[PDB]
Design a protein around this motif. Sequence first.
Motif, PDB file in Angstrom:
ATOM      1  N   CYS A  32       0.791  -1.035   0.048  1.00  0.00           N
ATOM      2  CA  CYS A  32       0.092   0.123  -0.006  1.00  0.00           C
ATOM      3  C   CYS A  32       0.854   1.330  -0.047  1.00  0.00           C
ATOM      4  O   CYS A  32       0.305   2.306  -0.336  1.00  0.00           O
ATOM      5  N   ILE A  33       2.087   1.237   0.466  1.00  0.00           N
ATOM      6  CA  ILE A  33       3.128   2.108   0.348  1.00  0.00           C
ATOM      7  C   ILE A  33       3.395   2.591  -0.960  1.00  0.00           C
ATOM      8  O   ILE A  33       3.659   3.696  -1.379  1.00  0.00           O
ATOM      9  N   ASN A  34       3.600   1.616  -1.635  1.00  0.00           N
ATOM     10  CA  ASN A  34       3.805   1.753  -3.149  1.00  0.00           C
ATOM     11  C   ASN A  34       2.800   2.414  -3.921  1.00  0.00           C
ATOM     12  O   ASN A  34       2.941   3.104  -5.078  1.00  0.00           O
ATOM     13  N   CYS A  35       1.585   2.163  -3.581  1.00  0.00           N
ATOM     14  CA  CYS A  35       0.295   2.883  -4.265  1.00  0.00           C
ATOM     15  C   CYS A  35       0.177   4.115  -4.072  1.00  0.00           C
ATOM     16  O   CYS A  35      -0.216   4.849  -4.768  1.00  0.00           O
ATOM     17  N   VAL A  36       0.696   4.957  -2.792  1.00  0.00           N
ATOM     18  CA  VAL A  36       0.614   6.208  -2.688  1.00  0.00           C
ATOM     19  C   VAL A  36       1.695   6.912  -3.428  1.00  0.00           C
ATOM     20  O   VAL A  36       1.855   8.107  -3.683  1.00  0.00           O
ATOM     21  N   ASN A  37       2.676   6.124  -3.800  1.00  0.00           N
ATOM     22  CA  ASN A  37       3.800   6.683  -4.508  1.00  0.00           C
ATOM     23  C   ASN A  37       3.370   7.057  -6.004  1.00  0.00           C
ATOM     24  O   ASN A  37       3.622   7.901  -6.564  1.00  0.00           O
ATOM     25  N   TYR A  38       2.508   6.013  -6.544  1.00  0.00           N
ATOM     26  CA  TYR A  38       2.125   6.004  -7.926  1.00  0.00           C
ATOM     27  C   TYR A  38       0.513   6.610  -7.877  1.00  0.00           C
ATOM     28  O   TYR A  38       0.040   6.353  -9.055  1.00  0.00           O
ATOM     29  N   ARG A  39       0.101   7.244  -7.205  1.00  0.00           N
ATOM     30  CA  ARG A  39      -1.008   8.092  -6.935  1.00  0.00           C
ATOM     31  C   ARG A  39      -0.659   9.353  -8.257  1.00  0.00           C
ATOM     32  O   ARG A  39       0.766  10.045  -8.040  1.00  0.00           O
ATOM     33  N   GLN A  40      -1.422   9.845  -8.879  1.00  0.00           N
ATOM     34  CA  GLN A  40      -1.222  10.816  -9.799  1.00  0.00           C
ATOM     35  C   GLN A  40      -2.348  11.857 -10.004  1.00  0.00           C
ATOM     36  O   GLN A  40      -3.270  11.507  -9.731  1.00  0.00           O
ATOM     37  N   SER A  41      -1.640  13.279 -10.211  1.00  0.00           N
ATOM     38  CA  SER A  41      -2.764  14.007 -10.447  1.00  0.00           C
ATOM     39  C   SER A  41      -3.153  14.251 -12.000  1.00  0.00           C
ATOM     40  O   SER A  41      -4.482  14.428 -12.278  1.00  0.00           O
ATOM     41  N   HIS A  42      -2.332  13.794 -12.963  1.00  0.00           N
ATOM     42  CA  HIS A  42      -2.783  13.856 -14.336  1.00  0.00           C
ATOM     43  C   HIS A  42      -1.959  12.573 -15.039  1.00  0.00           C
ATOM     44  O   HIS A  42      -0.985  12.110 -14.540  1.00  0.00           O
ATOM     45  N   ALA A  78       4.922   3.359   9.648  1.00  0.00           N
ATOM     46  CA  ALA A  78       3.971   3.559   8.307  1.00  0.00           C
ATOM     47  C   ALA A  78       4.385   4.931   7.877  1.00  0.00           C
ATOM     48  O   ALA A  78       4.388   5.610   6.823  1.00  0.00           O
ATOM     49  N   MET A  79       4.334   5.925   9.148  1.00  0.00           N
ATOM     50  CA  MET A  79       4.433   7.443   8.736  1.00  0.00           C
ATOM     51  C   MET A  79       5.861   7.704   8.339  1.00  0.00           C
ATOM     52  O   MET A  79       5.621   8.720   7.267  1.00  0.00           O
ATOM     53  N   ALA A  80       6.763   7.179   8.851  1.00  0.00           N
ATOM     54  CA  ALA A  80       8.037   7.468   8.151  1.00  0.00           C
ATOM     55  C   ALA A  80       8.352   7.078   6.751  1.00  0.00           C
ATOM     56  O   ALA A  80       8.715   7.975   6.193  1.00  0.00           O
ATOM     57  N   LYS A  81       7.728   5.909   6.466  1.00  0.00           N
ATOM     58  CA  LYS A  81       7.785   5.762   4.879  1.00  0.00           C
ATOM     59  C   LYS A  81       7.029   6.676   4.220  1.00  0.00           C
ATOM     60  O   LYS A  81       7.413   7.053   3.065  1.00  0.00           O
ATOM     61  N   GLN A  82       5.675   6.974   4.752  1.00  0.00           N
ATOM     62  CA  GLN A  82       4.730   7.867   4.120  1.00  0.00           C
ATOM     63  C   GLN A  82       5.599   9.282   3.898  1.00  0.00           C
ATOM     64  O   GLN A  82       5.375   9.878   2.959  1.00  0.00           O
ATOM     65  N   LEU A  83       5.925   9.715   5.162  1.00  0.00           N
ATOM     66  CA  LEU A  83       6.649  11.048   5.017  1.00  0.00           C
ATOM     67  C   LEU A  83       7.813  11.175   4.049  1.00  0.00           C
ATOM     68  O   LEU A  83       7.834  12.105   3.197  1.00  0.00           O
ATOM     69  N   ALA A  84       8.743  10.136   4.226  1.00  0.00           N
ATOM     70  CA  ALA A  84       9.793  10.067   3.388  1.00  0.00           C
ATOM     71  C   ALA A  84       9.333   9.835   1.935  1.00  0.00           C
ATOM     72  O   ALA A  84      10.352  10.212   0.911  1.00  0.00           O
ATOM     73  N   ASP A  85       8.529   9.216   1.647  1.00  0.00           N
ATOM     74  CA  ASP A  85       7.962   8.660   0.361  1.00  0.00           C
ATOM     75  C   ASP A  85       6.696   9.551  -0.086  1.00  0.00           C
ATOM     76  O   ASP A  85       5.869   9.086  -1.023  1.00  0.00           O
ATOM     77  N   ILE A  86       6.101  10.368   0.589  1.00  0.00           N
ATOM     78  CA  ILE A  86       5.282  11.343  -0.068  1.00  0.00           C
ATOM     79  C   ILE A  86       5.646  11.966  -1.101  1.00  0.00           C
ATOM     80  O   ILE A  86       5.281  11.907  -2.453  1.00  0.00           O
ATOM     81  N   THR A  87       6.773  12.695  -1.136  1.00  0.00           N
ATOM     82  CA  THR A  87       7.383  13.610  -2.011  1.00  0.00           C
ATOM     83  C   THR A  87       6.353  14.490  -2.795  1.00  0.00           C
ATOM     84  O   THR A  87       6.177  14.092  -4.069  1.00  0.00           O
ATOM     85  N   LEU A  88       5.987  15.391  -2.370  1.00  0.00           N
ATOM     86  CA  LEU A  88       4.834  16.140  -3.103  1.00  0.00           C
ATOM     87  C   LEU A  88       5.505  16.832  -4.418  1.00  0.00           C
ATOM     88  O   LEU A  88       6.556  17.160  -4.319  1.00  0.00           O
TER      89      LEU A  88
END
Length: 220
Positions: free
Chosen positions: A46-56, A124-134
Motif C-alpha cells: 500500500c506504500i507503493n500505491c501512494v507513490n504512484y498516485r497521480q494528478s494527471h 508507516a508514517m516514516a515511509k509515507q513522510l519520506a515517500d510522500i514527495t509532493l
Amino acid sequence: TTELKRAFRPLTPHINELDALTILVNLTDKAKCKQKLRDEKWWASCINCVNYRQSHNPKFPDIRSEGVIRTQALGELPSFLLSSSKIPPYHWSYSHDSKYVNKSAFLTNEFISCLGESQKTCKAMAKQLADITLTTINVTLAPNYLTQISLPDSDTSYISLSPVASLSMQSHFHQRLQDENRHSAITRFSRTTNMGVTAMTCGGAFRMLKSGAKFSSPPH
RNA sequence: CUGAUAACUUACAGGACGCUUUGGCUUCAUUGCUUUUCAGGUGAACUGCCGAGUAGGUAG
C-alpha cells in the motif's frame, strides 16, 4: 456494498471515523476481523500505491505509456479560458499497475483530504513522510508513448510540449454530464484496469462534451 | 512544424397470420357606382389601251 464502493471512488461526490477505516481495509481485498489482521507485507504494497498516485494521467489514450505526475497547473489563466486550475484539485486517482488497483484503496480513496497525505504506525508514517514527495514529475522521453508538440515560443525559438490528461477535469465533465444526454458524447476505452482507477469507476465510458446540434450554415 | 510521426473492421440473414366505423340535420334577412373626355400623320401611287367581263393582262 456497491454504493459504499462507488462513494470512495473519484467519480462520485464525497461523504463514524471508526466505521470508515474498516471499509477501506476491506476494499483492498479482491467483517471487522479481516480489518484486525495486520500483515507486514500488506503495508509495503500500500506504500507503493501512494507513490504512484497521480494528478494527471499520461496513460489516457495509450495504456502503454509510463509516467508519474502529481503537480498543479502553474499560474492562473483569465476568465474566458478554462483549465484544471479553476476547478478545485482533489479528484486524483491511481495508475501504473493492474494488480494494485484494489490495494490502492486504503491510502488513495480521499474521503476534502487523503489518508496518504503501535510500532507499525510510527514506521508507516516514516515511509509515507519520506515517500510522500509532493509535486513530482517522472517522465523519460526516450522509450515510451507520449505526444510531442513544438510551438513557436517567443520568436526564432521553439518549445516541445507533451499534453497530459488531467484527472480533476475528467471527473468534472463526467459527473456534470449525467443529466444532459444532448451534450454528452460517450467514448469507450478497453483494458480498463490497465488505464487506472479513474477508468474502472465509469467502466470505460468517459462521457465527453459534444457541441450541441449539427453544423448548419447561414449565407455568410 | 498540427494530443506530432504510422493505421483496411469484416462475414450470414423471410416479420407474418386476421378485421363492417355508424346514426340525425333549413344559413337567412337589407342594398343606386357615378360625373368629364378630338388619335392624328390623306400634298400623293396618276392617265390610257386589250378583253363579253367587279376575271386577267400589258403602255407611258
